[PDB]
Specification:
By secondary structure, the chain is mainly beta. About 40% of the residues are buried. InterPro entries: Osmotin/thaumatin-like_sf, Thaumatin, Thaumatin_CS.
Length: about 210
Amino acid sequence: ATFEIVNRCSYTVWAAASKGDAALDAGGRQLNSGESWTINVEPGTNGGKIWARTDCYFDDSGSGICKTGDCGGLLRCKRFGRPPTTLAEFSLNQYGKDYIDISNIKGFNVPMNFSPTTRGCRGVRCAADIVGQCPAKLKAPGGGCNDACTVFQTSEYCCTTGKCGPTEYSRFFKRLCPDAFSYVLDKPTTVTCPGSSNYRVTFCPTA
């Protein structure tokens, strides 16, 4: 499958792509404002994610650090990144269909559109100014807007079974981005696409 990753933001981002135990394609790359990076994601990739990282620096070998979304200090990510990270999540060729979503469950850093470039399904977007509106307690010192479970580490915010529901801090994200997950038990906002679709992830998509 082809994934085009396009940075429309005014700032540089360091894109990342991983399935948790390995890189997808090169795993990560600097994207200047306006730059695009096209990757190949193997058919049958389950549990893949793409995200942006902000305020990074790397040496010539690809070792360094990012303020949001750092993946073990690497440019070429092999594992998932440190919150807060807006997440494009996908599982491909799963019993004939692909499944895509955007999630704020691990916070928000950069606005994103995640859309098919082939026929037969909708895209999703979370492009509100979540960082500017971030509630004071959720502001991340290094930039971005943390999810409540990361900040508070209580069952109310982190529960995955219960006795578990939305809160004002999960609703903060859901109100601004209805089409992205805000907590683990949200009514799903996953899109089912034809198997073997192609996609574009756009950072700071055009309104």
